[PDB]
Each structure stands twice: as C-alpha cells, then as structure tokens.
C-alpha cells in the first residue's frame, strides 16, 4: 500500500509515534517520505548484502530475518516480509525498538540528511489528523 501524506500522518498518530522518544509526528512522516516514498512494500538492497524493508526501511542485519543477510545473528527475528504489510503495526513496533537503541532517529540516514532540524511540522500541515 502507498499512503497519502495526511493518511500516513493519521495512522502514525493512531500508532503512537507522535512524541515517541520526544520525536514529533512530522519527523516520522518526513522519514517515511525519504525512506520509502510512503510505500509499505519498498525494498532496497545494501552493498553489505542486507536489505531495508517497508515504510521505514528496517535493516535485515539487525532487526528482521530475510534468509540471505550475511552475519545476521538472530534467525527468530520477525520475518522481513512481515514489515511489508498494508497494516503498519509491525513496522511501527520495529521503528520504536530502533529509535530506543541509543542513536534516536539518527539510525535513519535519510531522516538525518533531509529531515533533522528542518520544519518537519510541514509534513503534517494541511492535515485533519
């Protein structure tokens, strides 16, 4: 599923990302735009042989199992395919774990390059929520 901007803003708010670890809703919407273009089925292969899955591009080395990532530790991690659902619940749960890992949203390089410190409220501006 490809979300509209205001549609995703509403679902991320319903899924408790607004002010999760202090990060306002617009950071999360901005992060999805530059990571996945609001597409829950986005996949991108890295040089290292890992893959990033879904609306927030969760990495297969650390957080999900895709069966082909060299050096992945925990084979019982949630299948990376479950992070591609029209329902964002599983992706939101992984993102909350990642953002609590010690680096905040700096874990998302696209957020850091394009969203951090900018007018992120613009990504929820015009939205009913």
């Amino acid at each position: 599923k490809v979300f509209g901007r205001c549609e995703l803003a509403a679902a991320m708010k319903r899924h408790g990302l607004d002010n999760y670890q202090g990060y306002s809703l617009g950071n999360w919407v901005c992060a999805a735009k530059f990571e996945s273009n609001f597409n829950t089925q986005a996949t991108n292969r890295n040089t290292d042989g890992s893959t990033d899955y879904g609306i927030l591009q969760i990495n297969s080395r650390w957080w999900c199992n895709d069966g082909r990532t060299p050096g992945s530790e925990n084979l019982s991690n949630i299948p990376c395919s479950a992070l591609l659902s029209s329902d964002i619940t599983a992706s939101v749960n992984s993102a909350k774990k990642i953002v609590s890992d010690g680096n905040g949203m700096n874990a998302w390089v696209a957020w850091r390059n394009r969203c951090k410190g900018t007018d992120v409220q613009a990504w929820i501006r015009g939205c009913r929520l």
Partner: antibody
Amino acid sequence: DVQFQESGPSLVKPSQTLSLTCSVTGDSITSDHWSWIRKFPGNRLEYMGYVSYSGNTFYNPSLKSRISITRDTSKNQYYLDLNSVTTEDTATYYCANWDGDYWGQGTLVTVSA
Amino acid sequence: DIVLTQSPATLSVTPGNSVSLSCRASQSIGNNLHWYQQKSHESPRLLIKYASQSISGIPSRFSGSGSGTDFTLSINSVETEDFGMYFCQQSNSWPYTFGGGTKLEIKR
C-alpha cells in the same frame, strides 16, 4: 524458548555494592534491549535501566548515578552494579527483555547489617 | 517523568462479571501503554502491548483500549485464577514508569 535468569548475593550490607548477573538462554532469542526492573516490598515497580542491542546504556535518573549496566555478548550475559545501597534498595530484582515478553524469576535482595 | 495513576488500588469482583481497570497518564503517551498481571511467587506476565495489541498465550477475555492519557484493561468473565496485581507501564518516554497497581480480589 527464551529464558532470562538472575543470580548473585541475596544480602548486601548498607553502603556496599549490589551486583547481579543475567543469563539469556534459549533457541528463540531475538534482537532486543536487555533491562533491569525491581519490585519494592510494597508492590512498587521501578524500571532501573537497560543496555540496547547496540550496547548503549539507559539509566533511571532516580537511581542518582549509583547504577552501572555492562554486558558480555560472547556469554549472552549482562550485569547490574548498584553502589552505596540502603534499606530503600531491598527489593525483588528482575532481568527482562525490553519487549516485556520474557522476565526472570526474580531474586530477593536484602540490604542489612 | 510520566506518572501513571491506577484508581482504585483495590477492586472486588464476582466471577463471570466484567471488570475495567483504569490507567491515567499525567501527559499524552499515544498507544505506548503495556499491561502486566503479577501473582506473588511469580514474574510479571505481559497481557497487552501498545494499549490494545494481543499477546500470544493470553486468554481472549483480556483486552485493552484507550490512547493519549486514558487507558483501560477489560476482563470479560473474570475467573478465579484472575486474582492478583495488574500494572500499567508506559514506554513513550525514558525513564519508563509503572502505575501503582490494582489488586483484584475474587468474591465468593
């Protein structure tokens, strides 16, 4: 199968250091943060701290900088050190995952002379 | 630090009846509210995560709802084995914090 198990002294003198070990075992282990939680005799629960999957520590500011968490990923072990204890530190200490799925049995620790 | 208020601290209930346990947060915490059952001689048992999400192995009679500052744990057809302490815990903000607990006493 995932099991968290605490061990270490059940008795600590006032002003000394409370030290506990957690051993994480099973064939079902997932990438998670590793936490310490305690339960005071009056049923109050306090989230003491955790060490992230990446090894970054988080400490409850209430513990007034007396707390240290370290880990040894080669042993699937992690450690709590709590300095300068008082009778206020008598509690049931649990190791648990950050997801809350898996908690240890709990070890009663008494601070007393 | 976020304060969770579980009121009342004690509730007596007749088996087969329904019960709602309140957890109010001092600031909005979205859905970032988890429910624990604790019996003496045992570790806390996670019942509900993120306000409403089902946990595998937890009987269907357990459900949660709410968001922002107002959360409820519901038990439909309270059974005798449902005696014990019920704790809410927030994960929106470090330090994570727990409510005071609600003790469930079974009537007979």
